[PDB]
Design a protein around this ligand. Structure first.
Ligand SMILES: Nc1ncnc2c1ncn2[C@@H]1O[C@H](COP(=O)(O)OP(=O)(O)O)[C@@H](O)[C@H]1O
Ligand SMILES: Nc1ncnc2c1ncn2[C@@H]1O[C@H](COP(=O)(O)OP(=O)(O)O)[C@@H](O)[C@H]1O
Lengths: 403, 48, 86, 60, 350, 201, 82, 130
C-alpha cells in the first residue's frame, strides 16, 4: 500500500473573504494562519496593528457590501497587502481558491476572475461557493449551511455538493443587528466610549459608579465612521464575552432570577447585565417584539431554515434536515446552538431525522469556509478543475461553465 | 441507474480528506497538550 | 542505604544491529572488523573491505552489495575499532 | 494492538495523507471496561464484556 | 545525542540536547564560503525570520554541523525550529534539504514560541518572542499555538540598533559604518536599558545629569550616553520614534489576546511570558506589566514572567523537548520521509 | 449497547500515530539506508483538456507517471443529437430546439442531476418546468435516439403521484399528525386483538 | 502519610486525563492485517478506509445515498397490472 | 509480575523514636505488557529484593501473602543477539500486573500416599548404592 491515490498539495492559497474578518492561508493546512479585520483604514492600512494607530483621517470602509465585493480598488489593495506581508509569496507562483457567496452576480464574478488573471497573473484559479466549502469542511455533500455572518443569516442548502440557489433565504438578522441593539442599550443605560485608542489610563471604579480616567491629547479623529468602528469593536467584545442567547420563550420570570455576570468597559466602568443580557439575542429567533422595529415582519433562524427547506424539492429535504450545518460567528454565542436545535425540533415535522453537527465546541465554525477550501484544494481529482492561465488567455474567460 | 461520474469520486475523496483533517486537528491538539503537561511535570519533578 | 538499594538508571535498551551486506537481522559479529553480519558471503565481503581499507590509509570508495530499491549507502563509515587481526 | 497487550477500544483503520495508515478510535461504556476486555480476547465487569460485544475483537 | 539548532535571526544557536545552555553561538551570516566577519559578500538569508535563499541556508547548516560542532548529522537527530508563521513551501524545502543533503536519521520542526513556553514551564500564555529581525506574539493554549491569533510586529534589535546609530550620530558620535555599528550594538546590549514612564524619566534626565553614563570605544574615544539610553528601546512601545506606524509590543500583545478565544484569555493574561534577546533590557518587565495593566481590565491579574535566559529560552525549550521521553515517538523517521516525502513534516506536529 | 458508527469523529476520542521512538534501538535499522530524492517537479495531467502544467511532490525516480487521478474523469453517457435529428425525431410543440439544447447542456454539466438542473434551470428564457417533466423529456429523447440508432419505460405519472403525496404528508400539521399516530396505534391494537383471537381459536 | 497518598493519587489521576496512547507501532501494525472470529467461529477481514480506487470499467453504479434515507431497494415482484 | 523499577521514597525516621534515616515504604514499578503499575509494598521485603539479583530491568514473581520475590530473568527486549547465555532472559508478562492464577490438579489418594511416603530434601539421600 503506497497510497498513490492519497492526495495532492499544489499551492492553492485559499482566501476566504468575509464581511467581519478576512481569512487566508495555504492549502493542506487545517487552520488559516492569516486572520485580520477586513475593513481598511482608508485615508490604505489593513492590518490588526496598522488599523489601530492614530493618523490624519483613517476612514474605515468594508469593500464587501452585503457579502458582495463592490470597491475593487480596496479589494485589490487588501489582497496585495495580505500577500506581501503575511504570505511573502509571489502572486504568479501559486494558484488561488478564493470563495464566494451563493448570490454572486455573473458580472461581478467575471470581474473578479479578470482581476485575478490580469493584475496578479496567478498560474490557476477556482472560485467555489462558501456554502459548498462549509459543507466539505464537515464532510457533508447534503445539508443546510446556516450561515450567520456579521451582515446576513442564510440557511443555504446544498445538493450533492451543489448549492440550491433558489433555496437561499437572505435574512437581515446578523451580527450587525446585535451590535446596533447593544449600542442602543448602552446609550440608554450609559455612554458608549472608545477603546483604549484614546483612553490614556484607567482607575479603580466601584461597580455601578461613574468611572474616571485621563484623556489622550492625540489627533481628534474627526471621522465619526472610524469612531463608529472602534465602538463596534468593543460592542462585539461585549457580545462575545457576556451576551448569552435565551433557551426558552424568554419569559420575564426566570431571567430576573438567574446569576449575575460582570463586565469592565475600556475605561474601567464596571456594570452588570444579568437581568437583560439575554434580551438582545431574541430577534435572531423571534423577530416579533424587537424594540428597534416593532412593526417588522422577519423570519427567525428556525423560520429561515424551515423556509429554505420548504422552497426546495421534497426529495432532498430528508438529507437537508438530517445534516443541518451551523456556521458563522453569531453561533459561538452561549446557548445559541442549543436554542436553535430546540426550536428546529419543535418546529420540524416529526418522523424526519434532525441532527445538529457537533462543531460548536471550537471556534473553527468561522473558519469552516477556509477549512473546506483547503480540503478541496488538497484533493487530487480536483486538480483538473482549476481555471488555468491558458483557459483565460485563450479568450474564453468564462467561469460560469467551468466554475 | 447510471455509472459514477468524476464528481461522484471527487466527493468521496473530499469526505475522506475532511475526516483526515478532522482527525489530524485533534491529534495535534492532544499531542501539544501531552507535551506541555509532560514538560511542566518534568519541571516540577526537577524542582522537587 | 546505597548497598541495599543501588538506585541505578534503567538498563539502556541496546541497539538492534543489522547486517550491512544484506540488511537482515545481524546474527554474528566479525571479530577483526567489529561489524555485525549474518551470512558467510557478508563475512567474506566484510573481510575484503577491511583488507582494502587497511591496505591504504582509508579506502576512498565503498564496497557495494545487494542494493535494494532505495539508494544503498554502501557503508564504509561503519568504523571497525578493532585493530589488525593478530 | 500488536506490541501492546491492551484493548484500545472501538477503532477503525483509515488511510491518511502521504500513504500513512491511521487508526481512529471512539468512546463508549466509560472506555474502561474495554481495557479489561483483554482477558476475553486473549483467551459485573465480566459478563458485560461478553454482552456488550460478540467477542468480535480484531486479533493482531 | 539529539541535536538542537534554533534558527534565530542575527545569531544562530546550536548544541546538544540535555545541556542547560547552547554550546555553539555564532552570527547567522554567510559569505560567498565563510561565515565569519570580514570584507566579503556576506549576506543575511534569515533577516526577518524566514529563509530567503536556501543556498546560504544549506551552507550555514553544514557550518553549524561540521565546523562549530564536531558531530555528524547523519548519526544524530536534529531538532529544528521555525517561525510561528513559517510558510508551507519553506518548511517542506527545509525538510527536504535536511533529509537528503545531510542524511539525518530523524528530525522534528517545532514552533519557537512553543519551545520558549516549554522553557518557561507554562501550560498557557502569550509568548512575546522578540528576535533580532522580527517580533511575534503567539498565544498558546494547551500547547496549541492558536495560529489565527498570532500577530507579527516588524521591528526588532536591528531597527533598534539603527535608531541608536541615528540618535548617537545626531548627537555627534561617529556611528555611521558597520565597523561602528558593531560598537553600537555592543552599547545597546550592555548599555541602553529601558526606563518606565518615559514622560517623567526623560524630564528628569534632562534636568539632572545623573542619568549620563560614559562609554569607552576601542579606539580610545569616550562618549556619554544619557536620556537617549531608554529612548532607543522606547520604539518597541512607541514605534513612532523608529519612523514606522505599527503598534507597540504591548499593544500587539493585547490585540493577540483579544483575538484569542473567550473563557481562556484570563489564563493567557496570567502567563504573559517574554522571549528573545531583544527583551534583555533591564526593567522592561515592569514597563510591560504596567502598560498591560493599564490597557487590560483592572480586574484582570496580569503577571509578566521573564526568566534571565530570555535570549536562549528557545534553545532550553528545544533541549527539554529533545530530552523528553514522550517526545521520542514524534521524531520523523527516515523511512517515513522516504515513503511520504517532505510533506511528512506537516503531519506528526504539535 | 453495541459498536459505534461515526463519519468524522466523536467527542473525546483520539487516534494513535506511527512510531518514531527508540532511535537507539533502531539506530542501525535506519542508518544503513538513505532517502529517495523528492523533487518539486512539474506534472501535466492529461485530463486538463488544455496545455496547462502544474507542480507536485514526486520522487525523481518516476519523472514520468503523468497523473494517477487522471483515470477518474469518466464523463456520463449523454447522447449528442444534431439539428436534423431533433427536427425529424425530437420535434415537440411545448418544447423547442433551444430549450432542449439548454436542458442537455445542463445535464452534461451537472452529470444528470435533475435536481440541480431544475435549480439552475433558466426559468426566464423558458417557462417554468418541473423536475419530473425534465426527467420525462430527457428519458424520452434518450429512448428515441437509442431506437433510431438501431432504456426502460419512464412514467411521469408516477412522479406526479409520489412528490405531491409526500409533500402533503410532510405538511402534516402537529394535531393531525398526532391523530394519525393515534390511529396507527389503534390499528396496531386491533391487529394484536386479532392475533389473540386467532391464537385462542 | 494519608495526605501524601491522597495527593499522589490525585497527581497520578491528572496524568491519566491527558492521553492514554498516541502511537501505533508502525513496525508491524502498519503492514500487518487484522482478523477476528465471532462467537460462531466465522472469519472476516478488517476493512481499512482507503481513498476512492481508480475505476477500470463502467462498474460502481451511481447509488445516490441521500435518496436511501427513505428507500431501501427494489423487489422483483410487483402489482403487475395497468 | 513485570519489569521492576525499584525506588525507595525517603521518609522521616521512626516518629516514635529519635531522628535519622528510615524507609516506611518501598515502591516497585512493575511494568507488564499491558501497562505499568507501581506497588507500594511493605518495607520489610527489602531483604528479599537484595537477596536475589533483582535489578532494574528483570521480571520478578511476587506473591500477595508471602511476598517472597523469585526473579524469573531479564527481559528478552535486552537479550542482544551477541550475548551468549540461556535461562537468564524471559519474555515480558502478558496481561495485567495483578494476576489471580487458578489451577486445578487431580491426583488420586494413592498419589498423595506415595508423595508423603518417600522423603525429599537433603539428608544424604543423593547416595546411589544404599
Ligand atoms: N459575508 C460573510 N460571509 C461569510 N461569513 C461571514 C461574512 N461576514 C462575516 N462572516 C463571519 O461572521 C463572523 C462574525 O463575527 P461575530 O459573530 O461578531 O463574532 P462573535 O459573535 O464570535 O464575537 C466572522 O467571524 C466571520 O467569519
Ligand atoms: N544584552 C542584550 N540585551 C538585549 N538584547 C540584545 C542583547 N544582545 C543582543 N541583543 C539583541 O537581541 C537579539 C537576540 O537574538 P536572537 O534571540 O538570537 O534572535 P532570534 O529570536 O531571531 O533567534 C540579538 O539579535 C540582538 O539584536
Amino acid at each position: 500500500s503506497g497510497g498513490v491515490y492519497g492526495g495532492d498539495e499544489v499551492g492553492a492559497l485559499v482566501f476566504d473573504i468575509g464581511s467581519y474578518t478576512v481569512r487566508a492561508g495555504y492549502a493542506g493546512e487545517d487552520c488559516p494562519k492569516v486572520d485580520f479585520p477586513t475593513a481598511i483604514g482608508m485615508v490604505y492600512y489593513i492590518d490588526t496593528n496598522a488599523l489601530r494607530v492614530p493618523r490624519e483621517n483613517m476612514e474605515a470602509i468594508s469593500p464587501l457590501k452585503n457579502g458582495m465585493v463592490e470597491d475593487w480598488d480596496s479589494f485589490q489593495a487588501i489582497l496585495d497587502h495580505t500577500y506581501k506581508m503575511h504570505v511573502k509569496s509571489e502572486a504568479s507562483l501559486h494558484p488561488v481558491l478564493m470563495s464566494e457567496a451563493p448570490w454572486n452576480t455573473r458580472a461581478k464574478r467575471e470581474k473578479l476572475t479578470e482581476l485575478m488573471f490580469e493584475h496578479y497573473n496567478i498560474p490557476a484559479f477556482f472560485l467555489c461557493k462558501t456554502a459548498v466549502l462549509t459543507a466539505f469542511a464537515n464532510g457533508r455533500s447534503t445539508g443546510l449551511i446556516l450561515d450567520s455572518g456579521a451582515t446576513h443569516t442564510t440557511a443555504i442548502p446544498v445538493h450533492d455538493g451543489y448549492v440550491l440557489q433558489q433555496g437561499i433565504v437572505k435574512s437581515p438578522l446578523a451580527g450587525d443587528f446585535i451590535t446596533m441593539q447593544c449600542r442602543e442599550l448602552f446609550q440608554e443605560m450609559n455612554i458608549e466610549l472608545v477603546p483604549p485608542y484614546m483612553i490614556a489610563s484607567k482607575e479603580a471604579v466601584r461597580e455601578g459608579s461613574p468611572a474616571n480616567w485621563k484623556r489622550k491629547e492625540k489627533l481628534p479623529q474627526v471621522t465619526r465612521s472610524w469612531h463608529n468602528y472602534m465602538c463596534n469593536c468593543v460592542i462585539q467584545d461585549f457580545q462575545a464575552s457576556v451576551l448569552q442567547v435565551s433557551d426558552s420563550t424568554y419569559d420575564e420570570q426566570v431571567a430576573a432570577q438567574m446569576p449575575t455576570v460582570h463586565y469592565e468597559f475600556p475605561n474601567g466602568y464596571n456594570c452588570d447585565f444579568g437581568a437583560e443580557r439575554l434580551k438582545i439575542p431574541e430577534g435572531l429567533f423571534d423577530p416579533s417584539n424587537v424594540k428597534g422595529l416593532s412593526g417588522n415582519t422577519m423570519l427567525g433562524v428556525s423560520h429561515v431554515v424551515t423556509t429554505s427547506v420548504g422552497m426546495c424539492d421534497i426529495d432532498i429535504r430528508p438529507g437537508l434536515y438530517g445534516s443541518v450545518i451551523v456556521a458563522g460567528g453569531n453561533t459561538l454565542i452561549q446557548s445559541f446552538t442549543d436554542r436553535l436545535n430546540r426550536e428546529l425540533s419543535q418546529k420540524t415535522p416529526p418522523s424526519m431525522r434532525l441532527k445538529l453537527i457537533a462543531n460548536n465546541t471550537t471556534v473553527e465554525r468561522r473558519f469552516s469556509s477556509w477549512i473546506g477550501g483547503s480540503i478541496l484544494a488538497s484533493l487530487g481529482t480536483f486538480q483538473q478543475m482549476w481555471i488555468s492561465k491558458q483557459e483565460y488567455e485563450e479568450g474564453g474567460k468564462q467561469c460560469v461553465e467551468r466554475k | 441507474p447510471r455509472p459514477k461520474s468524476h464528481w461522484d469520486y471527487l466527493l468521496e475523496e473530499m469526505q475522506w480528506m475532511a475526516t483526515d483533517f478532522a482527525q489530524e486537528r485533534r491529534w495535534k491538539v492532544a499531542a501539544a497538550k501531552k507535551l506541555v503537561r509532560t514538560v511542566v511535570r518534568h519541571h516540577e519533578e526537577k524542582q522537587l | 542505604f546505597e548497598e541495599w538499594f543501588p538506585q541505578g538508571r534503567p538498563p539502556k535498551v541496546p541497539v538492534r544491529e543489522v547486517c550491512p551486506v544484506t540488511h537482515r537481522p545481524a546474527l554474528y559479529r566479525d571479530p577483526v572488523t567489529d561489524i555485525p553480519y549474518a551470512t558467510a558471503r557478508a563475512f567474506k565481503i566484510i573481510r575484503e573491505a577491511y583488507k582494502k581499507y587497511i591496505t591504504a590509509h582509508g579506502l576512498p570508495p565503498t564496497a557495494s552489495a545487494l542494493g535494494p530499491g532505495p539508494p544503498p549507502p554502501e557503508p564504509l563509515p561503519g568504523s571497525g575499532p578493532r585493530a589488525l587481526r593478530q | 494492538l500488536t506490541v501492546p497487550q491492551r484493548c484500545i477500544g472501538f477503532a477503525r483503520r483509515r488511510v491518511g495523507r502521504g500513504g500513512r495508515v491511521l487508526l481512529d478510535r471512539a468512546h463508549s461504556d466509560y472506555d474502561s471496561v474495554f481495557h479489561h476486555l483483554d482477558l476475553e480476547m486473549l483467551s459485573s465487569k465480566d459478563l458485560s464484556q461478553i454482552l456488550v460485544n460478540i467477542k468480535s475483537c480484531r486479533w493482531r | 545525542a539529539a541535536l538542537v539548532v534554533d534558527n534565530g535571526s542575527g545569531m544562530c544557536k546550536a548544541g546538544f540536547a540535555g545541556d542547560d545552555a547552547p554550546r555553539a553561538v555564532f552570527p547567522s551570516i554567510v559569505g560567498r564560503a565563510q561565515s565569519k566577519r570580514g570584507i566579503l559578500t556576506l549576506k543575511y538569508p534569515i533577516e526577518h525570520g524566514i529563509v530567503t535563499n536556501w543556498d546560504d541556508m544549506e551552507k550555514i547548516w553544514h557550518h553549524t554541523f561540521y565546523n562549530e560542532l564536531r558531530v555528524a548529522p547523519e548519526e544524530h537527530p536534529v531538532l529544528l525550529t521555525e517561525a510561528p508563521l513559517n510558510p508551507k513551501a519553506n518548511r517542506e524545502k527545509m525538510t527536504q534539504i535536511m533529509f537528503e543533503t545531510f542524511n539525518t536519521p530523524a528530525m522534528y520542526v517545532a514552533i519557537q514560541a512553543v519551545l520558549s513556553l516549554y522553557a518557561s514551564g507554562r501550560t498557557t500564555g502569550i509568548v512575546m518572542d522578540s528576535g533580532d529581525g522580527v517580533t511575534h506574539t503567539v498565544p498558546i493554549y494547551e500547547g496549541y499555538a492558536l495560529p489565527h491569533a498570532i500577530l507579527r510586529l516588524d521591528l526588532a534589535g536591528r531597527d533598534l540598533t539603527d535608531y541608536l546609530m541615528k540618535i548617537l550620530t545626531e548627537r555627534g558620535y561617529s556611528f555611521t559604518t558597520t565597523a561602528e555599528r558593531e560598537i553600537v550594538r555592543d552599547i545597546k546590549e550592555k548599555l541602553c536599558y529601558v526606563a518606565l514612564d518615559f514622560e517623567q524619566e526623560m524630564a528628569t534626565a534632562a534636568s539632572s545629569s545623573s542619568l549620563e553614563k560614559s562609554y569607552e570605544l576601542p579606539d580610545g574615544q569616550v562618549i556619554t550616553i544619557g536620556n537617549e539610553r531608554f529612548r532607543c528601546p522606547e520604539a518597541l512601545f512607541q514605534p513612532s520614534f523608529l519612523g514606522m506606524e505599527s503598534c507597540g509590543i504591548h499593544e500587539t500583545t493585547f490585540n493577540s489576546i483579544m483575538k484569542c478565544d473567550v473563557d481562556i484569555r484570563k489564563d493567557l493574561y496570567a502567563n504573559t511570558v517574554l522571549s528573545g534577546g531583544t527583551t534583555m533590557y533591564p526593567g522592561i518587565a515592569d514597563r510591560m506589566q504596567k502598560e498591560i495593566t493599564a490597557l487590560a481590565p483592572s480586574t484582570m491579574k496580569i503577571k509578566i514572567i521573564a526568566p534571565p535566559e530570555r535570549k536562549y529560552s528557545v534553545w532550553i525549550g528545544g533541549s527539554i523537548l529533545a530530552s523528553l521521553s514522550t517526545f521520542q515517538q514524534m521524531w520523523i523517521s527516515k523511512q517515513e520521509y522516504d515513503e511520504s516525502g517532505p510533506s511528512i513534516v506537516h503531519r506528526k506536529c504539535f | 449497547y453495541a459498536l459505534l458508527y461515526s463519519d468524522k469523529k466523536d467527542a473525546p476520542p483520539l487516534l494513535p500515530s506511527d512510531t518514531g521512538q527508540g532511535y537507539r534501538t533502531v539506530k542501525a535499522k535506519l542508518g544503513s539506508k538513505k532517502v529517495r530524492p523528492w523533487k518539486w517537479m512539474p506534472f501535466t495531467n492529461p485530463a486538463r483538456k488544455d496545455g496547462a502544467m502544474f507542480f507536485h511532490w514526486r520522487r525523481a525516480a518516476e519523472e514520468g507517471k503523468d497523473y494517477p487521478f487522471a483515470r477518474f474523469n469518466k464523463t456520463v453517457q449523454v447522447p449528442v443529437y444534431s439539428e436534423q435529428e431533433y427536427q425529424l425525431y425530437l420535434h415537440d410543440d411545448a418544447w423547442t430546439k433551444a430549450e432542449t439544447d439548454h436542458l442537455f447542456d445542463l445535464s452534461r454539466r451537472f452529470d444528470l442531476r435533475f435536481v440541480v438542473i431544475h435549480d439552475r434551470y433558466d426559468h426566464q428564457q423558458f417557462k417554468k418546468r418541473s423536475v419530473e417533466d425534465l426527467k420525462e423529456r430527457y428519458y424520452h429523447i434518450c429512448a428515441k435516439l437509442a431506437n433510431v440508432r438501431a432504456r426502460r419505460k419512464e412514467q411521469l405519472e408516477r412522479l406526479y403521484n409520489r412528490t405531491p403525496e409526500q409533500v402533503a404528508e410532510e405538511e402534516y400539521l402537529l394535531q393531525e399528525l398526532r391523530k394519525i399516530e393515534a390511529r396507527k396505534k389503534e390499528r396496531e391494537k386491533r391487529s394484536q386483538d386479532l392475533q389473540k383471537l386467532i391464537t385462542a381459536a | 502519610n494519608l495526605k501524601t497518598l491522597q495527593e499522589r493519587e490525585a497527581r497520578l489521576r491528572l496524568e491519566q486525563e491527558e492521553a492514554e496512547l498516541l502511537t501505533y507501532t508502525r513496525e508491524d501494525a502498519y503492514s500487518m492485517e487484522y482478523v477476528y472470529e465471532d462467537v460462531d467461529g466465522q472469519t472476516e477481514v478488517m476493512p481499512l478506509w482507503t481513498p476512492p480506487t481508480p475505476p477500470q470499467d463502467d462498474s460502481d453504479i451511481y447509488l445516490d445515498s441521500v435518496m436511501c434515507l427513505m428507500y431501501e431497494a427494489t423487489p422483483i415482484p410487483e402489482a403487475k397490472l395497468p | 509480575e513485570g519489569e521492576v523499577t525499584e525506588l525507595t521514597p525517603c521518609e522521616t525516621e521512626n516518629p516514635m523514636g529519635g531522628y535519622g534515616k528510615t524507609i516506611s515504604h518501598v515502591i516497585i514499578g512493575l511494568k507488564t505488557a499491558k501497562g505499568t503499575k507501581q506497588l507500594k509494598l511493605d518495607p520489610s521485603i527489602f531483604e528479599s529484593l537484595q537477596k536475589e539479583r533483582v535489578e532494574a530491568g528483570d521480571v520478578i514473581y511476587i506473591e500477595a501473602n508471602s511476598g517472597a520475590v523469585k526473579r524469573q530473568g531479564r527481559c528478552d527486549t535486552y537479550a542482544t543477539e551477541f550475548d551468549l547465555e540461556a535461562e537468564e532472559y524471559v519474555p515480558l508478562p502478558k496481561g495485567d500486573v495483578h494476576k489471580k492464577k487458578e489451577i486445578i490438579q487431580d491426583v488420586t489418594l494413592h498419589d498423595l500416599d506415595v508423595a508423603n511416603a518417600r522423603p525429599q530434601g537433603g539428608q544424604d539421600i543423593l547416595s546411589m548404592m544404599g
